[PDB]
From a paper:
Here we investigated the aminopeptidase, P. aeruginosa aminopeptidase (PaAP) from P. aeruginosa, which is highly abundant in the biofilm matrix. We confirmed that post-translational processing was required for activation and PaAP is a promiscuous aminopeptidase acting on unstructured regions of peptides and proteins. PaAP contains an M28 Zn peptidase domain (residues 44–116 and 274–510) and a PA domain (residues 117–273).
Guided by the structure of PaAP, we designed a cyclic peptide (cyclic-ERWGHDFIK) cyclized via an isopeptide bond between the glutamate and lysine side chains. Cyclic-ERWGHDFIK was a potent inhibitor of PaAP with a KI of 22.8 nM, which is ~440-fold lower than the linear peptide. The structure of PaAP_T in complex with cyclic-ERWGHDFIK (PaAP_T(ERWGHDFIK)) was solved to confirm enzyme–inhibitor interactions. The structure of PaAP_T(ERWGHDFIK) is comparable to the structure of full-length PaAP, adopting the same closed/inactive conformation (RMSD = 0.3610 Å over 934 residues). Cyclic-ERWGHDFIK was predictably bound in the groove between the PA and peptidase domain, almost identical to the C-terminus bound in the full-length structure. Complete electron density was visible for the inhibitor, including the side chain linkage between K and E, which is shown in the omit map in Supplementary Fig. 6c. The inhibitor complex structure suggests inhibitor binding induces a conformational change, stabilizing the closed conformation and blocking access to the active site. Inhibition showed no time dependence, pointing toward this conformational change being a single-step process.
Residue numbers in the entry:
A (entry chain P): 3 to 11
B (entry chain B): 44 to 511
């Protein structure tokens, strides 16, 4: 899962 | 002044005629000048961003808009140098920055040497690790240790804050290793909302395995970053005319990364949308059009998320559609339309997103232009609209991905090169803009925005059909 550019998990 | 006529700017084939790429380029030059006068960036919580806000606000006020500059609290994150990681016990070993390990975005700074303690690991192909997801995983965790945590199931932020609440001095998260493609370093974040107070780095899977099996291991971990609690701003304006209960909203983030001026990302969307808004000042829409320039997108969609979450429920229900324009001037562009129907990547937007995608598709096709889908898995400022059930769509010309041979036949350019080789870089300046890409995508932005400003029926129909 992403939130913008980075993976959050 | 022909494009001051409401007859032209009110209709979907009129607005694109009046929205000229050469005028978008002039606005892009202004953003370039702003970056140049402000140390080369337009990043959140910098004078470059403030001057970008001033420019957008003044432009909208001269066009007759009332402008809302909406502040929100924001923890800025800046890496100030490379990290360090070395074993001190049982044997001295120096690990390599950006090969063995990297920072979690939004980590705190730190310099810690401590025993390394694995937390509820589940190794091997096909594992479903929940390492560090529950406070109970830390049942035997000694305060002051470095927590060695495996990626899996829950957010990095949760893993790191659980470890912090268990008294960890630092956190090393290693990639999950459940498949061969989940063993290297990745772009990962603990989130702008991280409050664990301790440093967090990401390591390769094989390093995690070896460390977890190294008796008496101690690691010396150094994270060189700054976090600063501050604020930044969204810029929001709407037409006086049009139904306030059936709002067509368009958005484009106005901030750049710290590394450069962000002329393609996302000066391109910001400037095209600003040109459109100036033209729409004279339009006679049926539905109200709202324009947003988002702050802190590059920090994790902070501004757009704040905007949606802070809307009173009665006001939120008035937004019928959201259109996102994030990177539409890519040097080696392709013609990408958000895959609202999930036909390419299997993720569907909220009801009505298929209709928006279909509108974009039909417009490119009518013009004899090729197009194809791009992913919508919460990569830009539609994310919180997506979470709230609001139909959305958008346009994209490509970023770090590599153009295929087929796409070079379809769109021109160079196969095997990135759509934007200056993505997130110092070189993402005015010279990094393809004006044909700007022409094509600002045309489509204007057509679909105008279309929906006259009728959201294509969206309404999918909403109605979804309800049964
Ligand atoms: C990393 As982005 C959503 O600003 O292209
Ligand atoms: Na990133
Ligand atoms: Na915050
Ligand atoms: Na040190
Ligand atoms: Na667990
Ligand atoms: Na948190
Ligand atoms: Na060929
Ligand atoms: Zn300087
Ligand atoms: Zn629990
Ligand atoms: Zn962007
Ligand atoms: Zn970006
Ligand atoms: Zn599709």
């Amino acid at each position: 899962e992403r939130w913008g550019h980075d993976f959050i998990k | 002044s022909i494009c001051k006529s409401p007859l032209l700017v009110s209709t979907p084939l009129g607005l694109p005629r009046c929205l000229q790429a050469s005028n978008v380029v002039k606005r892009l030059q202004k953003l370039e000048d702003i970056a140049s006068l402000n140390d080369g960036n337009r990043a959140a919580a910098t004078p470059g961003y403030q001057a970008s806000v001033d420019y957008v606000k003044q432009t909208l006020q001269k066009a007759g808009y009332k402008v809302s500059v909406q502040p929100f609290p924001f923890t800025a994150y800046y890496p100030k140098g490379p990290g360090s990681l070395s074993a001190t016990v049982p044997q001295p070993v120096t690990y390599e920055w950006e090969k063995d390990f990297t920072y979690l975005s939004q980590t705190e700074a730190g310099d810690v040497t401590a025993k390394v303690v694995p937390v509820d690991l589940s190794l091997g192909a096909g594992n479903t690790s929940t390492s560090g997801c529950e406070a109970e995983d830390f049942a035997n965790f000694p305060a002051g240790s470095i927590a060695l945590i495996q990626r899996g199931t829950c957010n990095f932020e949760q893993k790191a804050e659980n470890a912090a609440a268990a008294g960890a001095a630092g956190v090393i998260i290693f990639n999950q290793g459940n498949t061969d493609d989940r063993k290297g370093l990745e772009n990962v974040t603990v989130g702008e909302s991280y409050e664990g107070g301790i440093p967090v780095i990401f390591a390769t899977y094989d390093n995690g395995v070896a460390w977890s099996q190294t008796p008496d291991l101690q690691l010396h971990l150094v994270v060189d970053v700054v976090r600063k609690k501050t604020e930044t701003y969204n810029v929001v304006a709407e037409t006086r005319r049009g139904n306030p209960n059936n709002v067509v909203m368009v958005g484009a983030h106005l901030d750049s990364v710290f590394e450069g001026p962000g002329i393609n990302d996302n000066g391109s969307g910001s400037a095209a949308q600003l040109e459109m808004a100036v033209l729409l000042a004279k339009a006679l829409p049926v539905n109200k059009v709202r324009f947003a320039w988002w702050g802190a997108e590059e920090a994790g969609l902070v501004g757009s998320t704040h905007y949606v979450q802070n809307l009173a429920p009665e006001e939120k229900k008035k937004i019928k559609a959201y259109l996102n324009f994030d990177m539409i001037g890519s040097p080696n562009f392709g013609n990408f339309i958000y895959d609202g129907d999930g036909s390419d990547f299997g993720l569907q937007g909220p009801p009505g997103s298929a209709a928006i995608e279909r509108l974009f598709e039909a417009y490119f096709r009518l013009r004899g232009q090729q197009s194809e889908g791009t992913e919508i898995d919460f990569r830009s400022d539609y994310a919180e609209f997506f979470n709230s059930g609001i139909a959305f769509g958008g346009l994209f010309t490509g970023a770090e991905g590599l153009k295929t041979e087929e796409q070079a036949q379809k769109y021109g350019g160079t196969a095997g090169k990135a759509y934007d080789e200056c993505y997130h870089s110092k070189c993402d300046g005015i010279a990094n803009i393809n004006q044909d890409a700007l022409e094509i995508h600002s045309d489509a932005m204007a057509f679909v925005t105008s279309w929906l400003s006259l009728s959201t029926k294509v969206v309404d129909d999918e909403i109605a059909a979804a309800g049964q």
